[PDB]
């Protein structure tokens, strides 16, 4: 009976809530009340990178910590050498409304996507000397929101028709599809060992997915509005979520609960990006307040402010060797901080 | 030395500049309609040239880009409103089928009162204007709309009623105006009408830049 199934679902939800409420024997706010505060952290601009003609929506650090890629509404991707402020390649597009970009871990390919429902893969190492399109993946019914690489052969995408998928580049079709959300998905992030990943999807909920089986193992809830950014901790055992009601949160995957909430009484705007530092002590956030804030990750206070922009901060990133933080805003400029 | 790489960058920069002079002269129009709103015939008769479609053309040495959204406008989220750079919004609406009017009419109030579109113009095209001529001498508007206060056989009265109904749902009456027209198969003076309205909007902006207001 449908009523029997619904009652069983209610009983299962009660059991799950009771199990979660059983294990909260303390809190991080009390166990870490004896750590010397970090003190004021001030950073200055080291470079400014000019050359775009419109808003900037994405950026990604290459794996050597020196080259980076960016995508704007002009219809262009640009590859920058960060040490000396040059340009390596300028790639035109077939579609002007773009919303994501990625850099392959080996340094050969890049990816691009947007409102055309198609994900394009470009090849940079060629005999003839130019940059030519290598693959076009189609099969989603909505727009793409984020895309990441696993190797030079497999790619993972998330689309705005409530689904995520894993594509095989050599052949050109789907291998596994993940379904289970109600609204559209906005961001996903990959595990350090490339065995799991997480997604946030405008239901005030986030999910953990396995890549070799195709099933979800855990669903977290707690926010009040949309989720716009997500990232892992360097360990691989915690992740930080950013929402649209001026609030960040830190969740754990083994206790299956929520650990910290970062919020302040002077902040009444949304969040556009979240990233971590190498040792796991700093958390960075970009706001619509035209600035970036720097939080301590174990005390929940404020450490500092980076305030060099005159418009919304849309993109944020930290290197793999931990030397610089890069920001991109709707004023058509990127900046590097150290 | 291999400082010659720097020269490479300079060449790239030059090409970007040769696009900038063009980008500032482009005018964008966002087109919205319906299944029976005559979008296909309207596009076909202007001699122009699966997701978002674009059309690029020119009128009297000014470049126009028209963006067509093919039914995806059911997306109701903020991040799909990334069209904050357009200069006008163009509705096509069918005035023959009375029953559907409320449906089409409903859509208006959702797309016009949004906040990203506070400083853009609206152009309205009521279509066919001959099935009305046929029906008005046959069928009564009062069976569907009860507020028609005139004589439901005169075309002028009913047309005034329709345009008033559409105007009534735009709040914030005066930032930039709402225009209206009637057309069946003119296919020839449409460019002139769109051009006049865009030029009027540009004047509205210039009189604010110069502080002469």
């Amino acid at each position: 009976e449908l009523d029997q199934l619904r009652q069983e679902a209610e009983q299962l939800k009660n059991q799950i809530r009771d199990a979660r409420k059983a294990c909260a024997d303390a809190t991080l706010s009390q166990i870490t009340n004896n750590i010397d505060p970090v003190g004021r952290i001030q950073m200055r601009t080291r470079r400014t990178l000019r050359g775009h003609l419109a808003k900037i929506y994405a950026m990604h650090w290459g794996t050597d910590s020196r080259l980076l890629v960016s995508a704007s509404q002009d219809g262009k991707l640009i590859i920058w050498d960060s040490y000396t402020t040059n340009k390596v390649h300028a790639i035109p597009l077939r579609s002007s409304w773009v919303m994501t970009c990625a850099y392959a871990p080996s340094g050969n390919y890049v990816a691009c996507g947007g409102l055309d429902n198609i994900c394009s893969i470009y090849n940079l190492k060629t005999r003839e000397g130019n940059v030519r399109v290598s693959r076009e993946l189609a099969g989603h019914t909505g727009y793409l929101s984020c895309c990441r690489f696993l190797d030079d052969n497999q790619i993972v995408t998330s689309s705005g028709d409530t689904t995520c998928a894993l594509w095989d580049i050599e052949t050109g079709q789907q291998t596994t599809t993940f379904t289970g959300h109600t609204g559209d998905v906005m961001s996903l992030s990959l595990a350090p060992d490339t065995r799991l990943f997480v997604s946030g999807a405008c239901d005030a909920s986030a999910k953990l997915w396995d890549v070799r089986e195709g099933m979800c193992r855990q669903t977290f809830t707690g926010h009040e509005s949309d989720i716009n950014a997500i990232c892992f901790f360097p360990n691989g055992n915690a992740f930080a979520t950013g929402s649209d009601d001026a609030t960040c949160r830190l969740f754990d995957l083994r206790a299956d609960q929520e650990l910290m909430t970062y919020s302040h009484d002077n902040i009444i705007c949304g969040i556009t990006s979240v990233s971590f530092s190498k040792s796991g002590r700093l958390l960075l956030a970009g706001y619509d307040d035209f600035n970036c804030n720097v939080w301590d990750a174990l005390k929940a206070d404020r450490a500092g402010v980076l305030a060099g922009h005159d418009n919304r901060v849309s993109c944020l990133g930290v290197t793999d060797d931990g030397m610089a933080v890069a920001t991109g805003s709707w004023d058509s400029f990127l900046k590097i901080w150290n | 030395e291999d400082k010659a790489a720097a020269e490479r960058s300079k060449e790239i920069d030059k090409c970007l500049s040769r696009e900038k002079t063009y980008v500032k002269r482009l005018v964008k129009i966002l087109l919205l309609g319906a299944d029976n709103s005559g979008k296909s015939t309207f596009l076909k008769q202007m001699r122009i040239i699966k997701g978002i479609h674009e059309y690029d053309f020119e009128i009297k040495n000014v470049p126009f880009k028209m963006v067509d959204v093919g039914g995806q406008r059911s997306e109701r989220k903020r991040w799909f409103e990334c069209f904050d750079s357009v200069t006008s919004i163009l509705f096509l609406v069918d005035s023959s089928d009375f029953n559907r009017l409320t449906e089409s009419l409903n859509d208006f109030e959702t797309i016009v009162n949004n906040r990203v579109f506070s400083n853009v113009s609206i152009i309205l095209f009521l279509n066919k204007t001959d099935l009305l001529e046929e029906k008005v001498q046959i069928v009564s508007i009062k069976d569907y709309f009860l507020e028609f206060e005139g004589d439901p056989h005169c075309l002028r009265d009913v047309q005034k009623f329709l345009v008033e109904c559409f105007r009534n749902k735009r709040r914030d009456q005066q930032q930039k105006p709402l225009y209206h027209h009637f057309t069946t198969a003119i296919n020839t003076e449409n460019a002139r009408l769109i051009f006049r309205d865009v030029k009027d909007t540009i004047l509205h902006d210039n009189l604010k830049q110069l502080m002469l207001q």
Partner: single-chain antibody
Amino acid sequence: VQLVESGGGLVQPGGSRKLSCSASGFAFSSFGMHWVRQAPEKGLEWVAYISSGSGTIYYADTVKGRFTISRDDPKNTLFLQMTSLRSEDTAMYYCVRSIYYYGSSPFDFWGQGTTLTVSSADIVMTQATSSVPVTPGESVSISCRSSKSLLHSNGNTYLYWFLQRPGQSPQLLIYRMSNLASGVPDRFSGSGSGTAFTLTISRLEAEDVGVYYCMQHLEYPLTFGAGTKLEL
């Protein structure tokens, strides 16, 4: 990729000539070009350099003011015009491709060259030996020496290694002292330090016989070495 040159032949003293090179199979407008020369039975020497956008032009000492270089992009042709030739110009000429961006591979394709007959702050390089007898199946090591340190402040070292089989144009083996070029079997290696350089071949085979060359690219003019020949 394919480059074919033409315009050579025989001339009497005085007079003047012109050489052309035609390109196919790549983006000619994005590359720089070099003209390289070889004596009848001796080492290599460098003649001219023309760059992208036709902005920078470099000539050598025994050339300057007497030779001219030019390019035409839409027809994809490269020209060298020569005036008042002498006896020491009898030689065979090669055309070479180049590019410069972070991570690139300069000197990655060579033409097939033409024959022409006529009736100091420079950095010097020294090749150790003129010949080395070798045995199939055994490893070999060669070395050359320089007159300055090639380790610039930015961590690079600019030394190059080329190979020439009997009867064809040379092809690149090693660039920037530690890197392999595309198409080279994974048994060649190189190493060294400021002012000493060595190259190593493990497990010799057939078709590995020829003459080996080591190049510098720290500042113009570029200088070559005498060459080592392995006799199989």
